């Protein structure tokens, strides 16, 4: 039940929670300019900015 957008009881499962976070926080801040994709490390790494 936790692999679907909502559970059998119509409640947020962890798929929805994690998708929402990954789009509305991580990639948003990446587009802002505070994060960058290092293909070396196969990850996203905070850039050493003022923020």
């Amino acid at each position: 039940q936790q692999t679907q957008h909502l559970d059998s009881h119509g409640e947020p499962t962890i798929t929805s929670l994690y998708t929402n976070w990954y789009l509305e926080t991580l990639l948003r801040q990446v587009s802002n300019g505070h994060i960058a994709y290092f293909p070396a490390m196969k990850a996203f790494v905070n850039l050493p900015t003022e923020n």
């Binding site: 070396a40 490390m41 196969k42 990850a43």
Partner: protein, 79 residues
């Protein structure tokens, strides 16, 4: 060349899977586990008709032989 190529990629593999929070903590106490410097081996691995004194040498084949021997040695050592 084969020796250092295998060493480079083994080190990168080991560094990729290391806990990130552990690296952060170690840096915060001045015990940094340094990253491996990047290096440009891709062009060499793609060579297949190196020319020397009228012979055509497939560098890729020889590097594969040495690296496969090294991988077998690593697995044997682990077990």
């Amino acid at each position: 060349l084969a020796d250092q190529i295998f060493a480079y990629y083994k080190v990168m593999a080991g560094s990729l899977l290391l806990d990130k929070r552990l690296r952060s903590e170690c840096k915060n106490q001045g015990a940094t586990i340094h990253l491996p410097p990047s290096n440009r081996y891709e062009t060499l691995l793609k060579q297949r008709h190196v020319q020397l004194l009228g012979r055509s040498i497939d560098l890729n084949r020889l590097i594969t032989q040495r690296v496969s021997a090294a991988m077998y040695k690593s697995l044997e050592l682990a077990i």
